[PDB]
C-alpha cells in the first residue's frame, strides 16, 4: 500500500503575533524526506521547507520544521495576516524503487486580526435578467473579521433554498474577509414579491440592506 | 526556469485527455518531473513522476494515468475512463517535493457543452441617495467550464477589485461576481469578461444605478 500521510488538525486559528503548530504522521518511516507547502489562491503551492527542516529560499525564520521517521511538525510563530493559507506536508522519498510521494490532507490556518464590522451592499437584478427565466440578486459583505452569517428575507420570509455564498481569502495585510451571497429565484417568484433583504450577522450585531423590486 | 501545463478543458465522462508539461530553462531529464492534481475545494494529490526512463505511479492512478517524455522539453499525462472524480487542476512540478510548479491546467469532466457566461451589471437601486464613490460590479452567470477572466477598464482599473471565487451550481454551471469601488476618475466603468472555451469576450459598461 502507498504511504499515507495523516495531517492534523484540519484547521487551526491564532491571533496575529501568535504561534500555531500542525502535525504530519507517516504510515511508514521516511527518515527526513518530507516537505511542507503553503497554498493561497492566485499561484500554485509554494515550497516552505524541504528535508524536514531546511527552509526554502525567501522563507522567513518564523517557519520551523521538525521531526523525523514517522512524526513531523510545522510551527509558525509571530503569525502575520500574510500567513493565512492552507499548508500541506508531502512525503518525498525513494525507498526500494518506490517513490513515496503522498500528500497530507492539509491544515487551514486562520489568522485573527483586528475585528472589523462588515458593511453591506445589495444589488437588484439588472433589467435583462428576468427575460432569462431566472433572477440572481447579489449581496456583498465588505471587509470584515471575524466570520459572518448571511440570511435572505423576501417580504419578511427567511429563505432556505437558492442561496450561494463565496468568501474571498483573508486579506494578506489586515486579515479581513469579503463575502458575496446570491439569491436565485425564478422570474415568476421574483415578480411575486416586493421586498428583498440581505441580513449579515457578526456575533450579535446585524447589518441589513433591502430594496423593493418595483423601485429599481 | 519555468513550467507550463496545457491541454485542460471540458471532456465528456468516459473520455480521454492528454495534458502536457513544457519546461523552459532546464533539462527535464535531470529531475523527477511530477504530476499533482487538486479537485476544487480539496487537497493536493500525487499522481506520478518520471525521472529519465523510470516512471512511478500512485497506486490509485496505475493503469489509468500514464506519464511519458515526449520531447527534450515536454512530459505528458495521458488519462482514460474519466469521471467527475477527475475534475481538478493538474500541476506539474520539478521534483518530488520540489519548488518549481506550473500554474496548473483545469480538467472538467462533464457532459455539458461549453457555455458562455451571461454578464449582468451590478449597481445600487435607483432612488438610493447617490454617492461620489460607488461600488459597482458584474455578475458572470451560467458558464462552463472554468476559467473566465474578468478585468475592469481593460486592465487599467485594478485597485480595489474584488473578484470572488467561482461557485458551481447544482446544475453544474459556474458563476462568480466581481465588484470594484470607483469614483468619476474611472468612469465609465466596464467589466471585460473573457471565456477561453467559447472564444467569447463581453464588455459590460455598468451605469452607477439601476435607473
Amino acid at each position: 500500500a502507498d504511504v499515507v500521510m495523516t495531517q492534523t488538525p484540519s484547521s487551526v486559528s491564532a491571533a496575529v503575533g501568535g504561534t500555531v503548530t500542525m502535525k504530519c504522521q507517516a504510515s511508514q518511516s521516511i527518515s527526513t524526506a518530507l516537505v511542507w507547502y503553503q497554498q493561497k489562491p492566485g499561484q500554485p503551492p509554494k515550497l516552505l521547507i524541504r528535508s524536514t527542516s531546511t527552509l526554502a529560499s525567501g522563507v522567513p525564520s518564523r517557519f520551523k520544521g521538525s521531526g523525523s521517521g514517522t512524526q513531523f511538525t510545522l510551527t509558525i510563530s509571530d503569525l502575520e495576516c500574510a500567513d493565512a493559507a492552507t499548508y500541506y506536508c508531502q512525503s518525498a522519498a525513494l525507498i526500494g524503487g518506490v517513490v513515496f510521494g503522498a500528500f497530507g490532507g492539509g491544515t487551514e490556518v486562520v489568522v485573527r486580526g483586528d475585528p472589523v464590522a462588515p458593511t453591506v451592499l445589495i444589488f437588484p437584478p439588472a433589467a435583462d435578467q428576468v427575460a432569462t427565466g431566472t433572477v440572481t440578486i447579489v449581496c456583498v459583505a465588505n471587509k470584515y473579521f471575524p466570520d459572518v452569517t448571511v440570511t435572505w428575507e423576501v417580504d419578511g420570509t427567511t429563505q432556505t433554498t437558492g442561496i450561494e455564498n463565496s468568501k474571498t481569502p483573508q486579506n494578506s495585510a489586515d486579515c479581513t474577509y469579503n463575502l458575496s451571497s446570491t439569491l436565485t429565484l425564478t422570474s415568476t417568484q421574483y415578480n411575486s414579491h416586493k421586498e428583498y433583504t440581505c441580513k449579515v450577522t457578526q456575533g450579535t450585531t446585524s447589518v441589513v440592506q433591502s430594496f423593493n423590486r418595483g423601485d429599481c | 526556469q519555468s513550467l507550463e501545463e496545457s491541454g485542460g478543458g471540458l471532456v465528456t465522462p468516459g473520455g480521454i485527455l492528454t495534458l502536457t508539461c513544457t519546461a523552459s530553462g532546464f533539462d527535464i531529464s535531470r529531475h523527477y518531473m511530477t504530476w499533482v492534481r487538486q479537485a476544487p475545494g480539496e487537497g493536493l494529490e500525487w499522481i506520478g513522476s518520471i525521472y529519465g526512463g523510470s516512471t512511478y505511479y500512485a497506486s490509485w492512478a496505475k493503469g489509468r494515468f500514464t506519464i511519458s517524455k515526449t520531447s527534450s522539453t515536454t512530459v505528458d499525462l495521458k488519462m482514460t475512463s474519466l469521471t467527475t472524480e477527475d475534475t481538478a487542476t493538474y500541476f506539474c512540478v520539478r521534483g518530488v517535493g520540489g519548488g518549481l510548479w506550473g500554474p496548473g491546467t483545469l480538467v472538467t469532466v462533464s457532459s455539458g457543452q461549453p457555455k458562455a457566461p451571461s454578464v449582468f451589471p451590478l449597481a445600487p437601486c435607483c432612488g438610493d441617495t447617490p454617492s461620489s464613490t460607488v461600488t459597482l460590479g458584474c455578475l458572470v452567470k451560467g458558464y462552463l467550464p472554468e476559467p473566465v477572466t474578468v478585468t475592469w477598464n481593460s486592465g487599467t482599473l485594478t485597485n480595489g477589485v474584488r473578484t470572488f471565487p467561482s461557485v458551481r451550481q447544482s446544475s453544474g454551471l459556474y458563476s462568480l461576481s466581481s465588484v470594484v469601488s470607483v469614483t468619476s476618475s474611472s468612469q465609465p466603468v466596464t467589466c471585460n469578461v473573457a471565456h477561453p472555451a467559447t472564444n467569447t469576450k463581453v464588455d459590460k459598461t455598468v451605469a452607477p444605478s439601476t435607473c
Binding site: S29, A33, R50, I95, G101 | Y32, V96, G97, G98
Partner: peptide
C-alpha cells in the same frame, strides 16, 4: 544505521540539482 532499504530524500536531490 543504514540497513535494509535506504531512504533517499528526493526533496534534497531536487534542491541540490
Amino acid at each position: 544505521i543504514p540497513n535494509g532499504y535506504l531512504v533517499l530524500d528526493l526533496s534534497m536531490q531536487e534542491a541540490l540539482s
